[PDB]
Amino acid sequence: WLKALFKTAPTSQGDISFSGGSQGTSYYASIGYFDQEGMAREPANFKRYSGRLNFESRINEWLKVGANLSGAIANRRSADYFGKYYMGSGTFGVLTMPR
């Protein structure tokens, strides 16, 4: 009943960064991917696709501006029986199901 309700789950993530700058203007860019699959068979996961653009510049002697932009497309799912006591569910069921 352990294997009946829990599995090995994969977690994968990628990433690419760009960074540098010249003469008082900095930047930092990023795009990335992340997927963490839930190990309970009750589906759960967090997927994200990230973007970030960080920017900073000295325009003249008296002014310096910048932006720290970020964004994401994200997929959240949660296993929503855990912590409650339902026959056949969760680590509770792993132990308590008649074999």
Binding site: K84, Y85, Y86, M87
Partner: peptide, 13 residues
């Protein structure tokens, strides 16, 4: 919900 007795949480909650 075959629970004969779950304590609800507190500190956890």
């Amino acid at each position: 919900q075959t629970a004969g007795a779950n304590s609800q949480r507190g500190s956890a909650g």
